[PDB]
Design a protein around this nucleic acid. Structure first.
Ligand SMILES: [Zn+2]
Ligand SMILES: [Zn+2]
Lengths: 238, 50, 87, 61
RNA sequence: CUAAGCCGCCCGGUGGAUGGCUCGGCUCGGGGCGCCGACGAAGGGCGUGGCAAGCUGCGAUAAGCCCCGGCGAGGCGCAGGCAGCCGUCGAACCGGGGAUUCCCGAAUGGGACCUCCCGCGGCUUAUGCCGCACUCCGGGGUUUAUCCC
RNA sequence: CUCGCGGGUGAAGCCGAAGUCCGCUGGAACGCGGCGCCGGAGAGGGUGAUAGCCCCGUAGGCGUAAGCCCGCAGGGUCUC
RNA sequence: ACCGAUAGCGAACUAGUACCGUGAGGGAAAGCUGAAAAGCACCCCGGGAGGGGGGUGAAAAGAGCCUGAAACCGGGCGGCG
RNA sequence: ACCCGAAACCGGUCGAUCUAGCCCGGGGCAGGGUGAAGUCCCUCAACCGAGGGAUGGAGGCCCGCUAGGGGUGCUGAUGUGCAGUUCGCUCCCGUGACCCCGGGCUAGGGGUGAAAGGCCAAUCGAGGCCGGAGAUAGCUGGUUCCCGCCGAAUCAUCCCG
RNA sequence: GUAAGGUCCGGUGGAGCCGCCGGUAUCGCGGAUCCUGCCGGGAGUAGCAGCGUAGUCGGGUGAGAAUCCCGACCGCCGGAGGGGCCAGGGUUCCACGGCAAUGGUCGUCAGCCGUGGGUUAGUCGGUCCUAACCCCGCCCGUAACUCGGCGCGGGGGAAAGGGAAACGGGUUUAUAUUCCCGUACCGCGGGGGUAGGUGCGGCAACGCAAGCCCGGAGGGUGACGCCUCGGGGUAGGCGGACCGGCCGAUGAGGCCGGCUAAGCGUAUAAGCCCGGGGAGUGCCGUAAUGGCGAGAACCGGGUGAAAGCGCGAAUGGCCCCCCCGUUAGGGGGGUUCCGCCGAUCCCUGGGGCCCGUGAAAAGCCCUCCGGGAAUUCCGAUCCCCCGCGACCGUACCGAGAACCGACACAGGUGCCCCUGGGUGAGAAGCCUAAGGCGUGUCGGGGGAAACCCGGCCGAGGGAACUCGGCAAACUGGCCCCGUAACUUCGGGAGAAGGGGUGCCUGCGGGUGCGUAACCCGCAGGUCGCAGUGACUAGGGGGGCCCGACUGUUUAAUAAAAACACAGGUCCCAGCUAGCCCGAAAGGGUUUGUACUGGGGCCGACGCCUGCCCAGUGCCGGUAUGUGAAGCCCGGGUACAACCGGGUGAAGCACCGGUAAACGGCGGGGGUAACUAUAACCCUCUUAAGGUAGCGAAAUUCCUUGUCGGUUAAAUGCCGACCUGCAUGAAUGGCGUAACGAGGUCCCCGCUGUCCCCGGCCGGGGCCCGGCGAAACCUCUGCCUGGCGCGCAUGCCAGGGACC
RNA sequence: GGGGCCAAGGGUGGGGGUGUUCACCCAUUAAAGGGGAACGUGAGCUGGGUUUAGACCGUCGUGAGACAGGUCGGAUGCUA
RNA sequence: AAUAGGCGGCCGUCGAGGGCUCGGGUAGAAGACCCGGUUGAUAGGGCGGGGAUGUAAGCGGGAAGGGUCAACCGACCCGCUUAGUCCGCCGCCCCUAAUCGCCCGAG
């Protein structure tokens, strides 16, 4: 038969490649050598809108002349001063190791490994909660509801990510969705596999129904993982 | 076209010089056996290879 | 007109020649005005013009004669007061 | 569509132009290689055994 | 003394079969000879003739230039013309040895949406010359950069 | 190995016999009839028809710079 | 003891040429005057192309040039009508 | 293997000037209507309220032979055409998911697809070009001189017959 | 000679050819919808119409004129058939000489044939910068590569992005921002001075010539979306006066000309700023939003665009007049003003929208830091002057004949940029000025028919036509009144329906200095069948089905009820993840991180989504059974091969969750005030037996089900019943305002659809002069009954038939 | 009125639903007969049904898919 | 009408009778057909009759008004005016053209 959208996306064609030139750049922390054992002051110069980020971004100039781009926390003020390091005071916008962050605090942009730059809690309006601190690990509750253990030296920023509530309003128009998805080059509009020909989809056929259960095994080969992949259950939970 | 490169212009010039009839003195010298050459060309009918 | 002049980056003017023929003159648009580095307000004493016009002028006819000509008067005074107090 | 009216849009940049190496009008201009001799893609000539074109040149077929 | 029309013979037009010819092909035991290129190849582009468009040959010295030998009065390619010139101080032609040998092309100092453009060091009074690509081998200096020779 | 000497082979190439005799047919004899000749040469081709003797060639011989090879003479190295 | 110009290599010749396709690539047709140009001087007509005289040649073989078949077309003749 | 004809299968190569998608940089859409949020003013009473008048210009809004784009009916004309898809009238969109140019990328069991097996240079239920290749068929067609002598058979058994 | 064929005679031809014996072969033509070449009938026929129907009269050249040239008349386009110009074409451009061929006819003409010519740049483009993207080197993978690839280093990449500098007049057959004259500008280098090194005016914003060289940093500019509006200009246009000229009666009156470049010097508007000032029972302001003790009103000022103004500049261009006129020439006048409209062309500020954020670098300006020279010296961004500025394109069309489509193709590319007057809302339709054309290139004749295409009208009836009101017809602009069910309160809506509309004579009104210009009312008189008089310019209403809407689709028979869509819900994933491309290396999502990435289904909105986990699928567990190799033990083999057992992961067997996962949701035995049917209700049967809704449905076979409405007549449409062959809740159920070139039924109005067809107009058809094919063709070609491979022009017997 | 005979010169029409032939029905009428001609007649017409390629519903099939089961759309060449 | 007819007249053994050409339709796609052709009203022109529309241009007067209530402007109306225009219908008049000419034709 013919290929699937997911199969074609793996070849990195311009139809699926992200346009990483309209964006402002990646937001990674400064190298760990500066931040560890030292605390640096920085000034917020500008807050602007990143085409594909789901959150606003901000420019910071540090006392050592280094300029960086960060995810702006909610309530951040242009022209204010922030601190990065172990001795940074506990305030919104400050980055410091998880060992120095008291429990019950909201954090974001947590480093998976000390110095990796931050992977967790970066979407707009999201935050994580510090649960417990131990000499060898810090427990943090993530937006998905999971309790994950991080190395005590991992860095995180105090506050919540700006841009929350974005899903309160409707996308009223197909054109609104068109612009939203064209901003990042996501495949839109999307087709329904049940309305394709049998050559194209496992559910394709003249009749617009799936001829087989829609729960596919986790061991199925590529070109077959469609529908509900390795689903523990389906339907509405009462 | 209004804007041309020199190499293409020179090739077109060579083709233009090529496009001409056989000399009458050549015809009489050859005794009417040579009356034409394969490079004759009409601009609106036969187009250049380039 | 030529495709290059079909662009809207050129401003076009219709003029009538002394010989009685109408001609189309194309000119390049002038740049914007300088803005303060800190607050972004327009500056004073800095004429607008393309590079050739800017080079047509002397040094003292293209900026004000006061320290920090890149800032508006509030910002200039504020920065100097802060610097003096810090010193 | 697909017929007479379609051929009127052949006024754009030609796909192939003259090749400096082999002298044939087969130089893919947008991609930057010759579809006959491989100029701009390989140092050695593009020669294939299933092709009689390079034998026709020297009447060696 | 039949209008049209059909058949047969003769003459004429149309056409290019047949016959004859052949500097071209095809196949062969044996015999000869088998590489070229950074000292820049094969292939290609463009030029070159008094009249010169194609082919052939040549390369700004451009159907050609020089020298040593054969031949012995004609010669200026395919190609039957006009006009001219070349040759007895030996041409044309043939075998051998030299000179010139544009641009692209492995293409190579650096670039090619057009086989055309843009550079850096030394000598040169100036007209102009010799070097400058990558991957290595054998050496040298030093700036220890693989920098320079 | 050749400051040296002799020889062989080796480009173009050079020599190589014999009728253009009489009469007819013919635009033109390479044809017909008659009379002769050479031949280690009667393979083939051209020449206004089909030619051994008109011409080129053929049978058989000759010459050749550079280069290559053998020999003489002399000067060395190494092996047993 | 090969073919003899629809044959023989695609090419007996300005042939891998003309020409076809964006491209990879595909690819024809086309030989013959006469011994010698002696390639028709001069005359009448026509706007001209040509036509008719008159010359050359053993023979127009007259360049649309060796031989010149068949199919087709025009005329004359014999038979029918 | 007497000669010709297959749909098809495999290998390496060529194609996004048509058309599909996406990226970069640019040109275009007469005139009019309606009147969203925002922002107000006037008169009488005032225990509550009641009665009028503005301003502002949003919309995958509306009419529209502007330009541009599309192609419902006539099953009109043409149908060896002007045209290997065109022409007339009628009709639909016409500030948006809009239309179009220049520069780029995605290539064949692959691309691309608002999903019609659609489109990928007049070719798409697997493109084109050379090669395997003179593929194979029990199926269709063809198979060139003359006279003499003798002269049949479609039925028993076995075969994916 | 039975024959395949042989030989002889007459004619053409001009150089080779054969008998016999013996061998060899690309050795014998009627067919292959055979191949190549040539020629026939069709045929002097079609075509040379349809989308723009254009020619006529005098004169000229010429052998020859419907077709070529000049003048007049009559016409077409006139938001394009006019003007400028990319891509593509590559000589098609210009002059002279021509008509064998080409040109749908002819041709003296030509984008055609011959000869000779033609493209001039410091300023205009390339060249410079970088965008998406691409290439080479190292490196990794591959058996290997001209192959795939992350990272580092180098390079390229836009003739419509950024980006130093020139505009007038004239000149040639053909080039000009390029050539000539006049007037400018930029880059580099040089010479003489000067400002400054070592200088000033303002409270301030700021005004200034305000030292030189080398390297670095910072700021600004380059540099930016869409919608909407105010202000200031300029092209162009209109009315009046005056000067010159043409028409007109040598009247009124109409038309034509009254021109002005870069460069140089020069100011304000909005915005922003600088000083004084000290408000609120608040004042100030805009088209609007608005601003104020974080500083309003108000009084002074600074900086800041497009423009205008002066020189350039009248000696130039334009109009006119006069004398010489055999060619050939020479002089004199003028070119001056007011008032309006006014851009889609420029400058400048407001405001609004984004789950959408609308480029980079080169270059240029300023400031600041470090370093290096300068005192009888150094030295400019300021004046004056001198020298130098390389390479390539430059002709022409730019399209209903110069491009692509085989064409001098009604298509496409490029309508890519631009557009006087009247009417008018209008870049609409119609008329017309400028400019262009008569080459969307064959002409002539005619009551010269029939018939066909494109138009105009048709009495009486008004869909009786037809599958179906297909086609046509009705309505139509603007002002005023008036406007339903339903509804998501937005809409439906221009619902529906009714009245008016011309010209002329006078007033009133708005903004305005105005008797400038634009717009709004009022009264009176008057003509026609008709006053949006031409042109332009909706027909309307009521039921049902489907899809919420805008949008997309089979280029070339399907535009739809199909796809998409917003909204709903389900599944996987904490990132060395999940999903995916590869042979590997590496890679897409990823400059990403659960308000995220990926995978299915339903499809706005309102009310809802019932039961079933036995089957299939998936997920979790797995004590136990089975379970390959490997390992261990015994046998065998002077060693192995080989045979028998033990352990044995995944997977199966077993167990549990899961239906907005695939699917399923029957059947019997029955029962209550008859002899009425049906079952509130019990009992078996598989996992459980279809719940709310809807129902002869786009699903119903019987079927034109039965009943009611619509008709005189109803296989139709609508409402109802439920006997649902074979409805049903996310492969969603029911309903639904608005929407639709979707499907279907009915009503008013209208009409040549029809009774029933008849006239007229333009183009074909027909005739005449030219150019001139193709499809097709075994040879032929009258019939009735027959025989016959069963349906004969050709055979049999008859009947007809002059060409 | 019912049945039968001779007789083919003439007539045998208009409408509703349905693609319909047919059958049913309406108002008129003398009557509103049945049939053959390639189920006469598409180089005469129309294209409503049948009978491709698109799509929806019911049922069947694990599925691709199918249904003499419904429904919307779907081309008619000519120089004698 | 293959038994391819009858009759009156005219001509032949130079010649009756035709065709083209000319002016027009009782006719017509080409052909054909009909009337006229100086023995003349066939067509045109002139005049007269009969028709279709509906009262021309010009001049004079009035006109709702305005205008200095003056000169002048004014849609429209009335008179000369059954007008003006036009006729693919008819009658009379030879004023113009129906002319010159060419070719079959039995023996
Ligand atoms: Zn400031
Ligand atoms: Zn090449």
């Amino acid at each position: 038969g013919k290929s699937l959208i997911q199969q074609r996306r793996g070849k990195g064609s311009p139809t699926f490649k992200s346009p990483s030139h309209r964006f402002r750049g990646a937001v990674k922390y400064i190298p760990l050598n500066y931040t560890q054992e030292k605390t640096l002051r920085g000034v917020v110069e500008e807050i602007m809108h990143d085409p594909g980020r789901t959150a606003p971004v901000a420019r910071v100039k540090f006392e050592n002349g280094i300029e960086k781009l960060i995810i702006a926390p909610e309530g951040l003020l242009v022209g204010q001063e922030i601190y990065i390091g172990p001795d940074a005071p506990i305030a919104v916008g400050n980055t410091l190791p998880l060992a120095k962050i008291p429990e019950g605090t909201y954090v974001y942009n947590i480093e998976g490994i000390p110095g990796d730059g931050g992977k967790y809690v970066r979407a707009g309006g999201t935050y994580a909660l510090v649960v417990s601190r131990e000499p060898d690990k810090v427990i943090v509750q993530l937006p998905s509801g999971e309790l994950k253990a991080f190395n005590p030296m991992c860095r995180a920023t105090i506050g919540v990510v700006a841009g929350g509530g974005r899903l309160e309003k409707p996308l009223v128009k197909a054109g609104k969705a068109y612009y939203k998805y064209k901003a990042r080059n996501k495949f839109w509009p999307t087709p329904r596999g049940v309305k394709m020909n049998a050559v194209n989809h496992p559910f394709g056929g003249k009749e617009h129904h799936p001829g087989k259960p829609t729960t596919t095994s986790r061991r199925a080969p590529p070109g077959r993982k469609v529908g509900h992949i390795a689903a523990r259950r389906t339907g509405r939970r009462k | 076209a209004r804007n041309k490169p020199l190499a293409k212009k020179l090739r077109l010039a060579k083709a233009l010089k090529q496009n001409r009839r056989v000399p009458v003195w050549v015809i009489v010298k050859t005794n009417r056996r040579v009356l034409t050459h394969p490079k004759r060309r009409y601009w609106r009918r036969t187009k250049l290879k380039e | 007109m030529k495709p290059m002049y079909r662009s809207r980056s050129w401003r076009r003017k219709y003029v009538r020649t002394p010989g009685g023929r109408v001609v189309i003159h194309f000119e390049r648009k002038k740049p914007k005005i300088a803005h303060c580095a800190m607050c972004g307000r327009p500056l004073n004493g800095i004429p607008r013009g393309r590079p050739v016009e800017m080079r047509k002028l002397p040094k003292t006819k293209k900026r004000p004669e006061r320290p920090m000509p890149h800032l508006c008067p509030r910002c200039m005074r504020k920065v100097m007061k802060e610097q003096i107090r810090a010193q | 569509g697909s017929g007479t009216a379609t051929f009127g849009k052949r006024n754009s940049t030609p796909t192939h132009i003259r090749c400096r190496r082999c002298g044939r009008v087969s130089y893919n201009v947008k991609k930057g290689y010759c579809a006959a001799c491989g100029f701009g893609r390989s140092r050695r000539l593009r020669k294939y055994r299933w092709s009689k074109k390079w034998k026709k040149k020297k009447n060696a077929h």
